[PDB]
Amino acid sequence: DDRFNSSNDERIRVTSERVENMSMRLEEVNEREHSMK
Amino acid sequence: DLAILTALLKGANASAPDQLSLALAWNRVDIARSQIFIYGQQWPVGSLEQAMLDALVLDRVDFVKLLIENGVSMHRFLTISRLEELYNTRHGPSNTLYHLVRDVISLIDIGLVIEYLMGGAYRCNYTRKRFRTLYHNLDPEINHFPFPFHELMVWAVLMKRQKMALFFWQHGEEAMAKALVACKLCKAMAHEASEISQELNHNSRDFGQLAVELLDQSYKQDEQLAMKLLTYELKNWSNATCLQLAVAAKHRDFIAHTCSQMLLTDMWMGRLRMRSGLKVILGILLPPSILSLEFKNKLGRKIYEFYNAPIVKFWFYTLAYIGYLMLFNYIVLVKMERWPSTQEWIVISYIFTLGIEKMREILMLLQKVKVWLQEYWNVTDLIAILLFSVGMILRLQDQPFRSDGRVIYCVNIIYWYIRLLDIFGVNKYLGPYVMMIGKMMIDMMYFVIIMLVVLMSFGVARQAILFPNEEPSWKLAKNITGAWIVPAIMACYLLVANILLVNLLIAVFNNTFFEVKSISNQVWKFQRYQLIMTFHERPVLPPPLIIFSHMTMIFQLFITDDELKKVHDFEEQCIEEYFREKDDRFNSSNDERIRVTSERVENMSMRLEEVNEREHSMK
Amino acid sequence: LGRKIYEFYNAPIVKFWFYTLAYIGYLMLFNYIVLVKMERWPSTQEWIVISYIFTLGIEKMREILMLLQKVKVWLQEYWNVTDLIAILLFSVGMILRLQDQPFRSDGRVIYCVNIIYWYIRLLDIFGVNKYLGPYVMMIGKMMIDMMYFVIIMLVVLMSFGVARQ
Ligand SMILES: Cc1ncsc1COc1ccc2c(c1)N(C(=O)N[C@@]1(CO)CCCNC1)CCO2
Ligand SMILES: Cc1ncsc1COc1ccc2c(c1)N(C(=O)N[C@@]1(CO)CCCNC1)CCO2
């Protein structure tokens, strides 16, 4: 398991969906900030 | 969350040297780096020294790194007594020291162990007369080593603490001497423990790879100073030069580097600049014509230098052999009168002189004879002179014996011819090929065994059917009813002689070339050094005239201090550059640029959701 | 001591070097009972060479004992089969040795033809060495291809020979 989860082939695939999740949360934070403004 | 858990125990009291001792005990260097070594900490005298001692005895890398980074100077720390305490500890992981002590604890005994491990005429600094009389007790600077990193390097290698060895190598002066001495000691302890071994072979391969790289950088930066580093005589490591320590550790890669081959070629040409064969043979064959060539610069003497160029000795020491193989042939294909003719007295004599030089080389006892008999050509030479000798004293009898005399000479001429090979070895193309012929022979012997088995079987069957009544006879030994089986089982023999194994031999001498071609290219570039250091030692005169030089015996790069400091700086720039360049080549690769940005991504995501809940509360 | 030795005899490397010196003896005497005259009855070295084949037979069967399943497992590999043929033909020759001349000359025949196999077994003993064994196995594998190209060369050779003759 330690030889598996240190390889590049998982370190890319998890961080891709982490990136898209943070982008959608960022735009929801954007519309909340404009409503509070 | 273990750091504040340990900080609870660090906050339990205030004895800061005991706190540093406890931090060394739990073996967590980040805690001492964060909390202990801060501004305004009080320190008594002797606490840092005892802390350094307790850190060195227990295999602590980062603690010794941080204590050296915080005031501890090794030029004021280490004395002879505390180093003796380091060699007499009891906390070692795994050591083979006491076995070497019982095979050869006082430091003079340690120096005897080191001299036994390296071998040769290596005279270590512990066994000098300047260190031995100072050891009688057990200025203020009489127990301090001026170059203490060499002793720390030796203590790191001998007790097998590898990460400490790699740490101690990269500081101080004279890194390549320490690297080659480490490679020699690792290979010696590996062979001695075989006589752990895989670990020591790996460590020898490690220092060995590292030393070669520093040369690669030191050649990649400059050349004229680069040559100086290899040549200078160390005044510390037993009067050796780095190239001799490279060959004496049998490291085939260091000599294989281009700078070593260029230095050997500049040794080979000697005192000339003509960059050869027709000119150097015309120089011998026309002795007044030598003046037209171009010398170096730092008559009546312009010549004596020419005779000492080892390429000259070579072309005037192979013209003497060409003479010997032409006269010896003419003393065999011709009539032999009752006493020996002139060319026989000359051919007998050349073997005579060759014998006295060959023994004199050994003189310059059983260890010397074993080192001389380590390789094969001296052995074959010893047999050859001996049988051109039995034949020599059998020459001087009557006919029954004389005819026998022809025998030995007849059989003895094969070896001198088959030596020519060696002379042909020098050329930059025939030498690798000759080495290959040597390696292929083993396989020739094994398939000779298999072909002998099958040949003897079919021969015994064929000869046993076709001769039924043959009483026991020595005649049978000299050779050693339904005949129609004899043709068929003859033909199948050819079907398993000239079809199956010959084509097996061709298959096994075709898929073995791709490794032996890579091996021989290394072995030739290594063994040029033995040739070049061989002929400085053989006189100028030919072997049928060497009696003058032998009876005259029977009759009865040094550098200064400022260029030395330049050398120590040239090395310093290179060592730091290698580490920096290694780090810049590491941190630019993809395999770190992905792994750091993954955890950067997850950290920003968690901070983003905390910012999200804060923004909704503020809304 | 007094027993320090009996262990030595049970080390299997010992059995090996005292079970291949017995074979070296067998292939030297059998050669000397073929390249020499044969008197009307068998000589001493023939009684010893006949006997070694005799004992080898009883151990080989005893190994099988220790029924058709056992014989099939024993005949799973080839060297027992080749061994079974060899003892059998050094046998037909054994009972054809004991007749008159017309037959005696025939007797020489079988022994003459039978000596090839014992020599070609040596190979196996050579198999133990850590270099000759892989090579012997290779010789065994290459043979198939030898047989196929023997077939092709036989076709072409027979054609040109029939035309020329
Ligand atoms: C030299 C010498 N000694 C006695 S008679 C005589 C002259 O015969 C020649 C002529 C040309 C040569 C050599 C010998 N070679 C040679 O001597 N190689 C060494 C060095 O002695 C190194 C290791 C292999 N053997 C010894 C190699 C080929 O070039
Ligand atoms: C042993 C033995 N039996 C009857 S006469 C006799 C002594 O002859 C030798 C001498 C040296 C040997 C062998 C036999 N070998 C051998 O027996 N191999 C085995 C085991 O029996 C395994 C599979 C291949 N064949 C059988 C192989 C090579 O070493």
Curated annotation (Swiss-Prot), chain A:
User: Where does tissue-level expression of this protein occur?
Assistant: Expressed primarily in the kidney and, at lower levels, in brain, testis, ovary, pancreas and spinal cord. Expression in the brain and kidney was determined at protein level. In the kidney, expressed predominantly in the collecting tubular epithelium in the medulla, medullary rays, and periglomerular regions; in the brain, highest levels are found in the cerebellum, choroid plexus, the locus coeruleus, the posterior thalamus and the substantia nigra. Down-regulated in renal tumors compared to normal kidney. Expressed in the lens.
Give the subcellular location: Cell membrane
Family label:
Belongs to the transient receptor (TC 1.A.4) family. LTrpC subfamily. TRPM3 sub-subfamily.
Query: Assembly and interactions?
Result: Homotetramer. Interacts with TRPM1; the interaction results in the formation of a heteromultimeric cation channel complex that are functionally different from the homomeric channels.
Q: Which disease is it linked to?
A: Neurodevelopmental disorder with hypotonia, dysmorphic facies, and skeletal anomalies, with or without seizures: An autosomal dominant disorder characterized by global developmental delay, moderate to severely impaired intellectual development, poor or absent speech, congenital hypotonia, dysmorphic facial features, exotropia, and musculoskeletal issues such as hip dysplasia, hip dislocation and scoliosis. About half of patients develop various types of seizures.
Q: What is the documented function of this protein?
A: Constitutively active, non-selective divalent cation-conducting channel that is permeable to Ca(2+), Mn(2+), and Mg(2+), with a high permeability for Ca(2+). However, can be enhanced by increasing temperature and by ligands, including the endogenous neurosteroid pregnenolone sulfate and sphingosine-1 and suppressed by intracellular Mg(2+). Implicated in a variety of cellular processes, including insulin/peptide secretion, vascular constriction and dilation, noxious heat sensing, inflammatory and spontaneous pain sensitivity.
Could you tell me what this protein is called?
A: Transient receptor potential cation channel subfamily M member 3
Please name the source species. Homo sapiens
Q: What is the lineage of its organism?
A: Eukaryota, Metazoa, Chordata, Craniata, Vertebrata
